[PDB]
Design an enzyme around this catalytic site. Structure first.
Site, mmCIF file in Angstrom:
data_model
loop_
_atom_site.group_PDB
_atom_site.id
_atom_site.type_symbol
_atom_site.label_atom_id
_atom_site.label_comp_id
_atom_site.label_asym_id
_atom_site.label_seq_id
_atom_site.Cartn_x
_atom_site.Cartn_y
_atom_site.Cartn_z
ATOM 1 N N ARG A 10 0.832 -0.969 0.142
ATOM 2 C CA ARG A 10 -0.116 0.072 -0.244
ATOM 3 C C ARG A 10 0.757 1.389 0.077
ATOM 4 O O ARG A 10 0.568 2.199 -0.858
ATOM 5 C CB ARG A 10 -0.938 -0.066 1.258
ATOM 6 N N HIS A 12 4.568 1.469 -0.049
ATOM 7 C CA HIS A 12 5.856 1.258 -0.669
ATOM 8 C C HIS A 12 5.995 0.950 -2.205
ATOM 9 O O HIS A 12 6.958 1.216 -2.681
ATOM 10 C CB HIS A 12 6.834 0.855 0.271
ATOM 11 N N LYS A 41 1.742 11.620 6.230
ATOM 12 C CA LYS A 41 2.862 11.302 6.750
ATOM 13 C C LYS A 41 3.926 12.348 6.056
ATOM 14 O O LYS A 41 4.063 12.770 4.757
ATOM 15 C CB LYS A 41 3.259 9.871 6.666
ATOM 16 N N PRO A 42 4.803 12.816 6.982
ATOM 17 C CA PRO A 42 5.886 13.619 6.503
ATOM 18 C C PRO A 42 6.699 13.300 5.282
ATOM 19 O O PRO A 42 6.468 13.732 4.230
ATOM 20 C CB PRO A 42 6.982 13.699 7.697
ATOM 21 N N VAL A 43 7.218 11.967 5.302
ATOM 22 C CA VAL A 43 7.922 11.374 4.119
ATOM 23 C C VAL A 43 7.719 9.749 3.898
ATOM 24 O O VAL A 43 7.536 9.180 4.685
ATOM 25 C CB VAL A 43 9.435 11.725 4.485
ATOM 26 N N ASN A 44 7.696 9.610 2.810
ATOM 27 C CA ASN A 44 7.264 8.240 2.274
ATOM 28 C C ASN A 44 8.170 7.769 1.037
ATOM 29 O O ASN A 44 8.388 8.671 0.034
ATOM 30 C CB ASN A 44 5.999 8.195 2.179
ATOM 31 N N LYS A 66 16.470 -1.751 11.672
ATOM 32 C CA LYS A 66 16.802 -0.649 12.392
ATOM 33 C C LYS A 66 16.017 -0.911 13.817
ATOM 34 O O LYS A 66 15.499 0.044 14.109
ATOM 35 C CB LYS A 66 16.535 0.544 11.674
ATOM 36 N N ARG A 85 8.577 13.657 -0.003
ATOM 37 C CA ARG A 85 9.113 14.703 0.899
ATOM 38 C C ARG A 85 7.832 15.931 1.073
ATOM 39 O O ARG A 85 7.621 16.496 0.155
ATOM 40 C CB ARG A 85 10.178 15.541 0.516
ATOM 41 N N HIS A 119 7.539 -4.794 6.267
ATOM 42 C CA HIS A 119 7.912 -3.522 6.735
ATOM 43 C C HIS A 119 9.299 -2.909 6.077
ATOM 44 O O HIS A 119 10.260 -3.564 6.180
ATOM 45 C CB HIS A 119 8.254 -3.831 8.190
ATOM 46 N N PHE A 120 9.055 -1.859 5.705
ATOM 47 C CA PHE A 120 10.388 -1.107 4.770
ATOM 48 C C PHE A 120 10.856 -0.622 5.912
ATOM 49 O O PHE A 120 10.509 0.380 6.456
ATOM 50 C CB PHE A 120 9.690 -0.311 3.636
ATOM 51 N N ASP A 121 12.152 -1.034 6.426
ATOM 52 C CA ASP A 121 12.971 -0.475 7.236
ATOM 53 C C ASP A 121 13.617 0.880 6.476
ATOM 54 O O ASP A 121 13.059 1.509 5.896
ATOM 55 C CB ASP A 121 14.036 -1.460 7.989
#
EC number: 4.6.1.18
Length: 124
Positions: A10, A12, A41-44, A66, A85, A119-121
């Site tokens: 969804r 990434h 969201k701020p950044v993706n 992480k 951004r 999960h995209f780290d």
């Protein structure tokens, strides 16, 4: 595998275009994936690589998340990534994005079953 693999796809996943050169992309995408929904969201980051290419990573270089760690896998080479951004200012439906296009490698976490990234780290 029923909400996780989805969640990742969804936020990434974007295997419809090789790349993305424009703030148009980002602005529409975040809107399309309803990522601005409620609170944007701020950044993706969006991967411009085939979904299989991205799952493949689940069985590549074994790295350290992480957080916990391994179950984190790093993409051998370089992926077509696009960074979204946030910009404009104002905690409200006012969400604008700027489109930065990179060529980095990804660090993902996978819940296999067959293998599915959940999960995209870090993005490098």
């Amino acid at each position: 595998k029923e909400t996780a693999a989805a969640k990742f796809e969804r936020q990434h996943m974007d295997s419809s275009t090789s790349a993305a050169s424009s703030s148009n992309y980002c602005n529409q995408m975040m809107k399309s994936r309803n990522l601005t929904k409620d609170r944007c969201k701020p950044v993706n980051t969006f991967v411009h690589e085939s979904l299989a290419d991205v799952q493949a990573v689940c069985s590549q270089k074994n790295v350290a998340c992480k957080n916990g760690q391994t179950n984190c896998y790093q993409s051998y080479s370089t992926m077509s990534i696009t960074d979204c951004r946030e910009t404009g200012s104002s905690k409200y439906p006012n969400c604008a994005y700027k489109t930065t296009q990179a060529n980095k490698h990804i660090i993902v976490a996978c819940e296999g079953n067959p293998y599915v990234p959940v999960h995209f780290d870090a993005s490098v």
